[PDB]
Amino acid sequence: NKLEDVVIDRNLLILGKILGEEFGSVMEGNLKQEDGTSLKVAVKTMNSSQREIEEFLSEAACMKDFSHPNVIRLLGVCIEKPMVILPFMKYGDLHTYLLYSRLETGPKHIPLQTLLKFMVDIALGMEYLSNRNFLHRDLAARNCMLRDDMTVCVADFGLSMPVKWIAIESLADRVYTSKSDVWAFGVTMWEIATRGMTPYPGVQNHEMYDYLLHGHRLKQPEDCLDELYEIMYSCWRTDPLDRPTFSVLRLQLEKLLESL
Ligand SMILES: Nc1ncnc2c1ncn2[C@@H]1O[C@H](COP(=O)(O)OP(=O)(O)O)[C@@H](O)[C@H]1O
Ligand SMILES: [Cl-]
Ligand SMILES: [Cl-]
Ligand SMILES: [Mg+2]
């Protein structure tokens, strides 16, 4: 009953072109605001029990209350069939951006100081979520969005295959904790320092557990500072408990950036 303040009236929403397509489609849209003005949004669609539907609205109400510059907001949900409504980020996801920087007509070559700042943004957003015991469960550069001022925010968390982002302990069992998000953040850092390489070249998805079980990890990128590799490497320690917290990671990266 009380969790209806997360619901948006359908006729305040206009749906346009598809941005992306398995168990959902994401579309551009316009949302009319209490302001009277209209905002550009991205809309992701997704039993029929009353117990299961309240569990969704609660989670959504939770996410709508998140307010941090490095965490994307949930604007609300429309129910026709549920659709979650997020602000549209014109500059798109960090992974594509990273690939474009390696091509003419894309952003310029991204210097080290900018790549590190991206990692600090993501660490902060992750620290914010972790502080609220909210597991992300799908961190990767493709899920880090660029705001119009070029700050990075984490996205596509909560509300419920990317094998190469999944921590060893989570491959082995049905186990996902904050330390698994930390593993994923290391992979995301590696994606950023490689300017968008797919993790583990030469390793196939189905080989990933055997490969990790043998103690192999993502290799240091060619010209990336030893200090930076040490930080990402600590994210993949076999024992989840030996991995640093996000608060620890975030300060390590700030101090590294500050040193340059
Ligand atoms: N809030 C948003 N604003 C703008 N584009 C978005 C937003 N959320 C997702 N997208 C884009 O829509 C497409 C589909 O997103 P998604 O289904 O989350 O796929 P992916 O697996 O690439 O992250 C992607 O290209 C993604 O970058
Ligand atoms: Cl590549
Ligand atoms: Cl590798
Ligand atoms: Mg996504």
Author numbering: 575 to 595, 597 to 621, 625 to 658, 666 to 745, 762 to 861
From the study:
Mer is a transmembrane tyrosine receptor kinase with extracellular immunoglobulin and fibronectin-like domains that recognize ligands such as growth arrest specific 6 (Gas6) and protein S. Ligand-binding leads to autophosphorylation of activation loop tyrosine (Tyr749, Tyr753 and Tyr754), recruitment of adaptor proteins (Grb2, LimD4, and Vav1), and activation of downstream enzymes (PI3K, MAPK, and GTPase). These structures had good electron density for most residues and revealed the canonical protein kinase fold: β-stranded amino-terminal and α-helical carboxy-terminal lobes.
The ADP and ANP nucleotide structures superimposed very well with an RMSD of 0.11 Å. These structures show that the DFG-Asp motif is in the “in” position, with Phe742 buried in its canonical pocket, forming van der Waals contacts with residues in the αC helix, αC-β4 loop, β6-strand, and αE helix. In addition, the carboxyl group is hydrogen bonded to a water molecule that is trapped in the core of the active site, between but not hydrogen-bonded to the DFG-Phe742, Ala740, Leu671, and the nucleotide. The magnesium ion is coordinated to the α- and β-phosphoryl oxygens, two axial water molecules, the Asn728 side-chain, and the DFG-Asp741 carboxyl group, consistent with a typical protein kinase catalytically competent state. However, αC-Glu (Glu637), which is a critical residue for catalytic turnover, is in the αC-Glu-out conformation. The side-chain of Leu744 is buried in the interlobe pocket, above DFG-Phe742 and between the αC helix and the β4- and β5-strands; it is also protected from the solvent by the side-chain of the αC-Glu637.
